[PDB]
Structures are given as C-alpha cells and as structure tokens.
PDB file of C-alpha atoms in Angstrom:
ATOM      1  CA  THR A   1       5.493   6.244 -19.780  1.00 35.16           C
ATOM      2  CA  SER A   2       4.595   3.556 -17.160  1.00 33.04           C
ATOM      3  CA  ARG A   3       1.441   1.498 -17.177  1.00 32.68           C
ATOM      4  CA  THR A   4       2.278   0.142 -13.803  1.00 34.70           C
ATOM      5  CA  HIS A   5      -0.497  -2.276 -12.550  1.00 32.18           C
ATOM      6  CA  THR A   6      -0.400  -3.477  -8.908  1.00 31.39           C
ATOM      7  CA  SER A   7      -3.018  -6.021  -7.696  1.00 32.58           C
ATOM      8  CA  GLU A   8      -3.272  -6.096  -3.909  1.00 33.84           C
ATOM      9  CA  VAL A   9      -5.310  -7.626  -1.085  1.00 36.02           C
ATOM     10  CA  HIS A  10      -6.551  -6.723   2.396  1.00 35.45           C
ATOM     11  CA  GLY A  11      -5.989  -8.744   5.486  1.00 37.80           C
ATOM     12  CA  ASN A  12      -6.212  -8.037   9.327  1.00 35.11           C
ATOM     13  CA  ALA A  13      -8.009  -9.250  12.432  1.00 35.59           C
ATOM     14  CA  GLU A  14     -10.141  -7.827  15.346  1.00 35.75           C
ATOM     15  CA  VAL A  15     -11.424  -9.230  18.553  1.00 34.40           C
ATOM     16  CA  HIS A  16     -13.866  -7.924  21.195  1.00 31.65           C
ATOM     17  CA  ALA A  17     -13.753  -8.563  24.955  1.00 34.37           C
ATOM     18  CA  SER A  18     -16.019  -6.967  27.621  1.00 36.16           C
ATOM     19  CA  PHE A  19     -18.067  -7.576  30.723  1.00 34.26           C
ATOM     20  CA  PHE A  20     -21.030  -8.773  28.480  1.00 34.07           C
ATOM     21  CA  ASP A  21     -20.045  -9.373  24.860  1.00 34.29           C
ATOM     22  CA  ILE A  22     -17.162 -11.415  23.369  1.00 32.50           C
ATOM     23  CA  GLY A  23     -16.800 -11.257  19.616  1.00 31.27           C
ATOM     24  CA  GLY A  24     -14.231 -11.431  16.846  1.00 31.52           C
ATOM     25  CA  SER A  25     -13.622 -10.669  13.080  1.00 30.16           C
ATOM     26  CA  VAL A  26     -11.134 -10.907  10.243  1.00 30.44           C
ATOM     27  CA  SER A  27     -10.701  -8.166   7.684  1.00 30.25           C
ATOM     28  CA  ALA A  28     -10.379  -9.506   4.150  1.00 27.89           C
ATOM     29  CA  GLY A  29     -10.772  -8.307   0.589  1.00 30.56           C
ATOM     30  CA  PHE A  30      -8.960  -7.714  -2.700  1.00 33.41           C
ATOM     31  CA  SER A  31      -7.458  -4.822  -4.595  1.00 34.23           C
ATOM     32  CA  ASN A  32      -5.991  -3.756  -8.038  1.00 31.40           C
ATOM     33  CA  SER A  33      -4.248  -0.458  -8.608  1.00 34.64           C
ATOM     34  CA  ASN A  34      -2.982   0.987 -11.852  1.00 34.97           C
ATOM     35  CA  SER A  35      -0.930   4.155 -12.280  1.00 31.99           C
ATOM     36  CA  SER A  36      -0.933   5.591 -15.852  1.00 29.29           C
ATOM     37  CA  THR A  37       2.225   7.736 -15.223  1.00 28.00           C
ATOM     38  CA  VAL A  38       3.780  10.015 -17.863  1.00 29.27           C
ATOM     39  CA  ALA A  39       6.391  12.634 -17.296  1.00 28.94           C
ATOM     40  CA  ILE A  40       9.183  14.759 -18.907  1.00 31.22           C
ATOM     41  CA  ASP A  41      12.692  15.754 -17.732  1.00 32.59           C
ATOM     42  CA  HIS A  42      15.013  18.534 -18.985  1.00 33.31           C
ATOM     43  CA  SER A  43      18.698  18.840 -18.125  1.00 34.63           C
ATOM     44  CA  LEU A  44      21.582  21.282 -18.596  1.00 33.20           C
ATOM     45  CA  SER A  45      25.160  20.333 -18.080  1.00 33.13           C
ATOM     46  CA  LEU A  46      28.165  22.649 -18.397  1.00 36.38           C
ATOM     47  CA  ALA A  47      31.631  21.212 -17.940  1.00 38.52           C
ATOM     48  CA  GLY A  48      34.946  23.023 -17.915  1.00 39.92           C
ATOM     49  CA  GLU A  49      38.504  21.744 -17.983  1.00 39.44           C
TER      50      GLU A  49
ATOM     51  CA  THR B   1      10.091  -4.541 -16.439  1.00 39.72           C
ATOM     52  CA  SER B   2       9.575  -5.369 -12.791  1.00 37.83           C
ATOM     53  CA  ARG B   3       7.252  -7.346 -10.484  1.00 37.67           C
ATOM     54  CA  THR B   4       6.757  -6.009  -6.914  1.00 39.58           C
ATOM     55  CA  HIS B   5       5.698  -8.396  -4.269  1.00 38.99           C
ATOM     56  CA  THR B   6       5.121  -6.355  -1.032  1.00 40.20           C
ATOM     57  CA  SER B   7       4.215  -8.446   2.018  1.00 40.36           C
ATOM     58  CA  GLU B   8       3.605  -7.182   5.538  1.00 41.16           C
ATOM     59  CA  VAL B   9       2.946  -8.147   9.085  1.00 40.14           C
ATOM     60  CA  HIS B  10       1.099  -6.017  11.747  1.00 38.29           C
ATOM     61  CA  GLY B  11       0.116  -6.031  15.383  1.00 36.74           C
ATOM     62  CA  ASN B  12      -2.300  -3.456  16.880  1.00 35.36           C
ATOM     63  CA  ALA B  13      -4.113  -2.837  20.198  1.00 33.35           C
ATOM     64  CA  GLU B  14      -6.914  -0.235  20.864  1.00 32.89           C
ATOM     65  CA  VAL B  15      -9.331   0.388  23.800  1.00 30.31           C
ATOM     66  CA  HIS B  16     -12.246   2.850  23.666  1.00 30.84           C
ATOM     67  CA  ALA B  17     -13.455   4.622  26.783  1.00 32.15           C
ATOM     68  CA  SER B  18     -17.115   5.279  27.347  1.00 33.00           C
ATOM     69  CA  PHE B  19     -19.590   5.458  30.286  1.00 30.90           C
ATOM     70  CA  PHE B  20     -20.643   1.774  30.781  1.00 30.63           C
ATOM     71  CA  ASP B  21     -19.058   0.481  27.607  1.00 30.38           C
ATOM     72  CA  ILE B  22     -15.525  -0.889  27.453  1.00 31.47           C
ATOM     73  CA  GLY B  23     -13.701  -3.232  25.051  1.00 28.57           C
ATOM     74  CA  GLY B  24     -10.217  -3.997  23.796  1.00 31.27           C
ATOM     75  CA  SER B  25      -9.624  -4.366  20.020  1.00 31.36           C
ATOM     76  CA  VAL B  26      -6.196  -6.148  19.694  1.00 30.95           C
ATOM     77  CA  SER B  27      -5.385  -6.680  16.023  1.00 34.79           C
ATOM     78  CA  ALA B  28      -2.807  -8.094  13.677  1.00 35.12           C
ATOM     79  CA  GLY B  29      -2.604  -7.716   9.867  1.00 31.95           C
ATOM     80  CA  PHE B  30      -0.921  -9.047   6.730  1.00 32.90           C
ATOM     81  CA  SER B  31      -1.495  -8.245   3.113  1.00 34.63           C
ATOM     82  CA  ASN B  32       0.638  -9.441   0.143  1.00 32.01           C
ATOM     83  CA  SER B  33       0.621  -8.147  -3.385  1.00 31.13           C
ATOM     84  CA  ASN B  34       1.062  -9.327  -7.004  1.00 30.97           C
ATOM     85  CA  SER B  35       2.055  -6.244  -8.953  1.00 28.82           C
ATOM     86  CA  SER B  36       3.386  -5.501 -12.411  1.00 28.18           C
ATOM     87  CA  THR B  37       5.848  -2.616 -12.951  1.00 26.08           C
ATOM     88  CA  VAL B  38       6.829  -1.663 -16.554  1.00 23.65           C
ATOM     89  CA  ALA B  39       7.982   1.518 -18.176  1.00 26.36           C
ATOM     90  CA  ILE B  40       9.225   2.919 -21.599  1.00 29.37           C
ATOM     91  CA  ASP B  41      11.708   5.757 -21.278  1.00 27.33           C
ATOM     92  CA  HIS B  42      12.967   7.837 -24.261  1.00 27.27           C
ATOM     93  CA  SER B  43      15.825  10.317 -24.342  1.00 24.49           C
ATOM     94  CA  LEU B  44      17.631  12.562 -26.609  1.00 25.61           C
ATOM     95  CA  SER B  45      20.758  14.575 -25.920  1.00 24.29           C
ATOM     96  CA  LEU B  46      23.043  17.149 -27.553  1.00 21.58           C
ATOM     97  CA  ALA B  47      26.662  17.375 -26.415  1.00 19.90           C
ATOM     98  CA  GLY B  48      28.412  20.347 -28.118  1.00 22.45           C
ATOM     99  CA  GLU B  49      32.076  20.815 -27.338  1.00 21.37           C
TER     100      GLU B  49
END
C-alpha cells in the first residue's frame, strides 16, 4: 500500500522567427500527482537437496 | 520512505512548412520535482520442511 505523492512543475521555452513576425514564449506551470497503489503477490518455492 | 527529486534539461527545434507561412520553433526545457514516496508492505510465509 503506497500513498505516493509527487508534486511537479512545468518549464520550457519557445521562440518565433519569420519574414514578418518575431515572437517568443516560456512554458510554465505546476503539478501534483498522487498514486494510491495497492497490490498482492503470491509465491511458491520448492527446494531439493 | 523516499523522496524523489527528478530534474531534467531539454533542447528542441521544429519548423512547420506552409504556403506563405514559415517559422522555426527552437526550444529548451527543464522541470524539477518535489515528491514523496512511501509504502507499507506486509508479508506472511510458511516454510514446511
């Protein structure tokens, strides 16, 4: 059982160049991810000697 | 318990082709993280010999 909480961000860039228009930008934001993960695992093991 | 800190660099470049439209979108990105990773694991066993 894992209540794994990951809080992230966004960041990039972008520019524009042309015959007419020159522009730019920067991508920016925020994030928060959480994964409510549960599982189950069975196992056999047979050993000889 | 755990605490992931995933960082990143990037560098990108795209150009779109149209009739009278042109432009180069050269990019670069970076996005860090402040996470929280935790889990509770149970187990039984039965070793019969």
